[PDB]
Structure formats: structure tokens, C-alpha cells
Design a binder for this molecule. Structure first.
Ligand code: XFG
Ligand code: XFG
Ligand code: XFG
Ligand code: MN
Ligand code: MN
Ligand code: MN
Ligand code: MN
Ligand code: MN
Ligand code: MN
Lengths: 317, 317, 317
């Protein structure tokens, strides 16, 4: 089935942020048996392997922006790989790797499906520009590079000349926001982007959040869905092995609900599983908890339901 | 009052599953002060003791089905004990023991009140038949033995010739589901059983879940309610000393809400507190946490309200 | 701005309850950087200091009521300090200290704003009278001293002759109740006080809870809001270093939701942050978790939003 035909892309890349270990995310998600688990769920899985990201020595900052050429090149390569998977009629499944890789993942997905609408699950908006950033970490900026409305607000950053903004402010929905920088809040409000911060989740419940998200993106006409999932979108009691944990996040149940609802549209076309950092657990159990939650999230995207699943056969015979 | 008149039955039985210790459930719930706590809540409590379950040596399997004669006999004896408590005008309170004991609890209760509706609080449906089961553990099959629509799908299992299905698929509501076998999902869907898996709980909220459950069972006419509570229905952060724990369960609040709402009907007629296994805690605190949550759930069933309680006297005099 | 103009009052007082350490609540909230954090959020903060509470030797009980003169005097002094802050056109921010101090905090606030409405966030009603109390702890009685409908039910307690009931039963809404004494439940029902015990929160969701609370208090016309927040209203998994912890409380998210909603009215006029006890943590982390949650609560009251905040400047220039 279309909704269960997958192309796995490993993106072992960490230079969009300063914490070592996020490059081990594809390895640990594979070691947990993600591919096997998906195959046991009637998925047609093709593994495109782990992208080689050749070292760029002397990758000096663009102002405060760290490793621009490396981040630019990794996303550029990933865009080509995602476009190939999309041309092969498969849902692209990007195993990260820091969230700067979403530049390549969506850009690549938008080359084959330009009418796509994004669902961004994160505690963070990742919408800082190279000029509003105070950290210079590119995993906090991918959305600014992708938005058509911010063309003219993005300076010429080395490694990013290949980037053409592929999404309008109306084609993205945020879910799980709770750590937004002033520049980002300003951008979010002046561009009128649709979002459900934890405040809206608390007000409405995840049921109405999903009803509104899917209606806002798909109401007019069915279109492909790109879900960019930052594991820090979920509460640190579920995904603690991550770079930027923020308290009061989405529960394990809320995460499964989001992904179950997306599955049920039959329109998932791209998926990013990001910011899993296996060297950031306080104990080895914190690492396995994060990886297991990330696996459970991914499996929900491709049909795994809490009410159960069965094959189209008579089990009472 | 009818809703606070109780007959306690201990069912120290473990052979419906492979993990030792669940037979200690009645002991540990009693030691926690359950009887005394109920009496402090204006309950008329009579203790019918712990059933003796005389050893059946040479209880060889029926195909893959383990200890069929022992499970069959324990349920058969429990049905007789429950029918006696029901004849004595008391709400039967079965302290388990594994969930295969629900065969006897509900069969026994249905002898006195054949019009009863069942609320099944669990992470599992427990509706495998002796032919769909892959484990052969009878705690995973009690509902299949009880359903009238499955008559002809249940083979002649040694120890179960006394069983006559007493409930129709429309007389049961499941709450908390999150671990359903394929055969069970097939049965659940083809029989059109009403259920609220974690997915529906997430979508609707526990408020609407309870409104729908009580309307669905009591809308046509008021009838007696049998609540079969498996402690694994709740999240393992609340009930960890249990055999088959599954992440993402019902919260402590959701468990208290379900039982509050049932109490308020004035129609609770039978209660099962099952799967408490005091030898399955990782620490002694995990055991006391489980037992305390089970006690709290029980007290809500017999009137303990979070808003408070008061006697019909003038407290300001 | 009115909603961000604050007068800080430290109330290091513990004699309304028997557990030592709650007098250290103002110290630990200050050490966490509360004042500085408020100033970084565009608040105009004036610090009125920590009240000196002189020892009252020979403070004999009034029946079972412990330290009546000390509790009466601390509240009396606090009422004078709150009235001063209110006359200076600032929102009074009381850092406690036990909940007995709410006698002084609301009485003082009502002298300047007699039309105020009270939101009481707590696991408890604190509405026991000196005659319904079984513990004799005055932090479990402040509402009874304040209610006009209970005039004639409050005996002449030494230290409280200065007290004039300033609020009617219709001017108070409780949120998070789950541990109510019989006498308190009787008072709550016979006076017809509006409340959302954890049962109503579970039923309605915090969104509807807040909608109803604000409509019930502000419906007729805008009036000043007094939020008396007891950190035990929140679940002990968020605020464990407190005297009277009760399981199944409001979540970190729900607490922030209540305070974000109150901020948005622009009508917060009085705030109490009570029952933080830094000597009641099991680990040093339990203390920092409680203090951090209490800081987050206070900050949402003065504008800190989870969707983010920005200054009225062009961030894209
Ligand atoms: N503290 C946040 C908000 N802004 C910061 C930045 O701009 O560097 C961090 C970005 C998180 C990226 B993430 O969502 O992929 O984790
Ligand atoms: N993992 C579940 C689903 N089905 C399995 C089986 O058929 O043996 C397990 C039974 C649990 C019993 B219980 O609900 O009483 O806890
Ligand atoms: N268990 C409660 C209810 N009544 C008791 C009392 O009257 O002393 C306890 C007081 C807690 C007050 B507090 O909310 O300020 O913590
Ligand atoms: Mn991100
Ligand atoms: Mn993030
Ligand atoms: Mn069960
Ligand atoms: Mn179960
Ligand atoms: Mn209080
Ligand atoms: Mn309290």
C-alpha cells in the first residue's frame, strides 16, 4: 500500500548544533530493529543507506552562524536523496541527525511534490534567520530557509546557494511549541503561521488539535503531508536523550495520537525523525527510552494502531 | 446503601498466566487495609474469605492452552461463590488473581442478574479464543468464553463444560486498550463491540468516554453493572507490579474518573480487581504503589469522591 | 503596564502548619532569580522586602487551634503591607510561607479593591472553621475567616479580632480540589461555592475549566482578580517539596494554562505563591523541581507565554 511503502535514508549529521552524538541517531534507531518492525507491519521497506557526509575542514562561521558549508552540503545531498526516493514512489523516512537536515528533506520532497503541507512537531519553531539567531546553531533556523515569505531576510550564507524557498507560511502547522525566541515569536505572529503551542494543546486537547491541523492543511484539497518530527516535541520524561529538552511537552499518548491521525489520512509522503542523541542520556535506560519512543512514533506513522491491527483474512476460520 | 454493601471474595489463582505471584494479590490488597478503608467510607463489608483452589495435578495442555482444568475449575468455583454473594444482596468484590477468573466472576454474577452490562478496564481485550491464542495463557481469553456470538468458535476445552456464554457483544464496553492481538482485533471489529482504546481516550477525553459508555450500556434501560478492572489498564507509572504492562495507559486521574462515574450510577453490582502481582515490582516501592493505586480505584467504586464526602449532619453545630 | 507592575512581599511564616521549612519559601524563590526573571519580562518590580514576624511567646492554643496569636499577627501585618502595595498601583505578589497568610493577603487586597474575585488553586479547600478543624492547623482554615456567609460560625479566636469577612461565597472559585474534609464538603455544598475539583478538570478539560471560571467571575463586569496559588494544587511529580502533597493533581501544563489565561484578562491584582517547603524534598533535585515549577507559575501570571513573547520592535530589521 502507498501509505506503507517506505524509503529509509540515514542522515548521520550533527554540525547543525554543538552537542556531539546526534550523528549516532540513525545507527541506534536501526539497532532497535526499526526496519524489521516496519516489515512485520506489512510495510514495503527499501533502505537507501546512510549518507556519507564528507568532512569540510576550515568551515569558518558566517557571522555567528556555525559550520555553514557543512550544514549546507549535508542538506543539499539529502535533498537529492529524498527526491530520488520520492520519484521511486516511496514515502521518504529520514533518520537524523539534527533538525537543520529538514532544509534538505523538505526541499527534496518539494521538488517531486510542490503542493506539500508540513506538520512540524517540536518544542521549537526552528524559524530563526541567520540574522535573528543568538546561538548561530543552524538546527534552530531550517524553517527560515524554507519560507517564501522570508526571501530577502535570509543573507547569502556559504553552502546555501542551492536553496530556493519551497513553502509558504500557510503551508506549515506547528504542534508542541513551548520555547520560542523573541525573533521567532515576531516572525510567527507577523507571517500569521498556524500553530498549536502547548497552550492550545491544553485548551483544546490533542483530538481537536489534530482535527484543526488536518482540516487547515487538507480542507481545500488532498495534498501530500511532510511530518518533521523533533523528538524534543515530546516531554523529556519520554525522550530525554535529546539536545534541547523542554519541560511540559507532548505526552507519549499525544505523540501516538498525532501520528495515528496522520497515518489515517493516507497522505503521509515524507517523515523526519530528528534530534535523537544517544550520548545525552543520564543513564543507559534514558537512551533506550528515547529510541523506543522514536520507534513507536515512526511505527504509528505507517499504520501501527493502539486499538490493534489485523491482516485481511478470517481469523475465526 | 446498595451501592456500599459489599461481599469480598479472595481468588488467589495464578494458573491463567505463567508468572508466579498474582495469587498473592488478595493478601497484599487486604494488608493495605482495603476492608477497614471501605468501612470508614460507610460501607457494609462482609468478607467471604479466600477461595481454596485445590491442586489439579496432571493438568496437561489442550493444544497450546495451559492448565485448562485448573483455570476451568477455579472459575467454576468462583461463579458459585459470586452467585451466593449476589443472592445475599451484596456487590461482589473479587480480589484476583489473574484475569481468567473473570469467566467465573461474570458467569456467577449473570446467574443472579442476567441483564448485566460489563465495563472492561484493561490494556488488552482478553478476547482470544483457544484457537486464536498464540501464548495459550487463559487470562488472555476470558471474554471469548463469555460471548454468545462466539458460540461455535470455542472448542470443548477440559474444565469448561459448565460454561454457557452469558453476554452479547453489545453488553460490553472496553476502556484503555493499547495491546490487541490480530485475532482479537478481527473479533473486536467483526462483532462490532463498543471500545475506547487509548486513541479514543486521547480524541474525546475521559469525560466523553464515560458519558458514551454509560449511555451506551444504560440508555435503553437501567441494568446492573459488572466492572472488570485489570490494573494493567492504568499506566505502568501507577501500577507497575503486574504481568503484562504497556506504556501509555490510563492516568491515576482517569482511573478515578471512570470508577467515580460508575459509582454515581448507583448500578455497580460486581467488581473484579485483577492482575496485581506483588512479586513483579522492580523495587518494594513499585509493589506498594500498585497496591495503593488498586485500593484507591476500589474506594472510588464504593463512593470515595475527590470533591469530598460528608454525613447527613450539621457540621457547623 | 498595569498587568506587569508588581510589588513583592516576602512572608517567611510557618506557624499555620506544623512542618518546619515553609518559612524558607521566599528565600529559595528569590535565590532562583524570580525578581530578575520578572524584570527580563518587561515587569516593573518593586521589592517591599521580607516581613519580620516577631516571636509571640505564650501563644497558647484556642481549643485545638495551634499558634492563633502568631497566625493572626502575621496575617494582620501582611494585610497592612498588601494594602500599601495596592495603594501604590501595583499587583501584590506574596511569597509564602504557609496558606494561613491568605487571611492577610486577601483582607489587605479587599481594603483597596472590595469588588475582587478569588481564584483558589490548591488540592484543598482550606475552609475549615476553628470548630470543624481536626488538626488545629490554621493554614487549613483561611477561607472560613474571609467568608461573609460564615460570620457567626467563627468563634472569637485570639489574634483575629482585626478580621472582617470581605468575600461572599459567590466571589470564589476553587480549582484542583481532591482532598476535602467532611466539614469542608458540607460548607462547600450548603454555601453553594463554585468549584472544579479534579473530577471536573477530568470531565471538562482545563480549557473549559478556565472559560467557566473567568465567565463566572467576570461575566457581569470586569473586576480585580486575586489568585491564591498553593503549589500542592499541582501534582507531587512537579511540586514534591510541600507539606500536604496529594496524588493526581494538576499537571505542569495545566498550572501554566490557568496562569496564562488569568494573565490575558489583564485583571490580575493579587497573587499568592504558597506552600513551597525546601526542607521537604526527598533529594536536592525535588526542591529545585518545586522551586522551578513555582517560578514558571509566577512568570506565566505576568505575561510569560509558551507560544513565545517579543518586544514591540521589528525583529526583521
Ligand atoms: N532553544 C531553541 C530555540 N532557538 C534556539 C536556536 O535558535 O538555536 C534553539 C533551537 C532548537 C532546534 B531544535 O528544535 O531542533 O532542537
Ligand atoms: N499481551 C496480551 C494480549 N494477548 C496476550 C495473550 O493472548 O496471551 C496477552 C494477555 C494478557 C492478559 B491480561 O489482559 O489479563 O493482562
Ligand atoms: N488535608 C488538608 C485538608 N484539611 C487539613 C487541615 O485542616 O489542616 C489539611 C490542610 C492543608 C492546607 B493547605 O492547602 O494550605 O496545604
Ligand atoms: Mn527542531
Ligand atoms: Mn526542538
Ligand atoms: Mn486482563
Ligand atoms: Mn491486561
Ligand atoms: Mn492551601
Ligand atoms: Mn493545599
Amino acid at each position: 500500500a502507498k501509505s506503507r511503502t517506505i524509503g529509509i535514508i540515514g542522515a548521520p549529521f550533527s554540525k547543525g548544533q554543538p552537542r556531539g552524538g546526534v550523528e549516532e541517531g540513525p545507527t541506534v534507531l536501526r539497532k532497535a530493529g526499526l526496519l524489521e518492525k516496519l516489515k512485520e507491519q506489512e510495510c514495503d521497506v527499501k533502505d537507501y543507506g546512510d549518507l556519507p557526509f564528507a568532512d569540510i575542514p576550515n568551515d569558518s562561521p558566517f557571522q555567528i552562524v556555525k559550520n555553514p558549508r557543512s550544514v549546507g552540503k549535508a542538506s543539499e545531498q539529502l535533498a537529492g536523496k529524498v527526491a530520488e526516493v520520492k520519484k521511486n514512489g516511496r514515502i521518504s523516512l529520514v533518520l537524523g541527525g539534527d533538525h537543520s537536515l529538514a532544509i534538505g528533506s523538505i526541499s527534496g520532497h518539494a521538488r517531486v511534490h510542490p503542493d506539500l503541507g508540513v506538520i512540524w512537531v517540536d518544542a521549537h519553531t526552528d524559524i530563526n534567520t541567520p540574522l535573528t539567531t543568538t546561538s548561530g546553531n543552524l538546527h534552530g533556523q531550517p524553517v527560515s530557509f524554507l519560507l517564501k515569505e522570508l526571501k530577502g531576510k535570509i543573507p547569502d550564507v556559504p553552502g546555501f546557494s542551492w536553496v530556493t524557498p519551497c513553502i509558504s507560511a500557510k503551508d506549515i502547522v506547528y504542534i508542541g511549541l513551548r520555547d520560542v525566541d523573541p525573533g521567532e515569536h515576531y516572525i510567527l505572529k507577523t507571517l500569521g503561521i498556524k500553530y498549536f503551542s502547548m497552550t492550545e494543546v491544553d485548551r483544546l486537547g490533542i483530538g481537536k488539535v489534530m482535527e484543526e491541523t488536518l482540516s487547515y492543511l487538507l480542507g481545500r484539497k488532498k495534498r501530500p503531508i511532510h511530518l518533521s518530527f523533533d523528538v524534543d516535541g515530546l516531554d523529556p520524561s519520554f525522550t530525554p536523550a535529546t539536545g534541547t529538552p523542554v519541560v511540559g511537552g507532548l505526552t507519549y499518548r499525544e505523540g501516538l495520537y498525532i501520528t495515528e491521525e496522520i497515518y489515517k489520512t493516507g497522505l503521509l509522503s515524507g517523515l523526519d525523525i530528528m534530534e535523537v542523541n544517544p550520548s545525552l542520556g543520564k543513564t543507559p535506560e534514558e537512551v533506550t527510552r528515547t529510541v523506543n519512543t522514536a520507534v513507536a512514533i515512526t511505527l504509528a506513522c505507517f499504520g501501527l494502531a493502539r486499538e490493534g491491527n489485523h491482516k485481511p483474512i478470517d481469523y475465526l476460520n
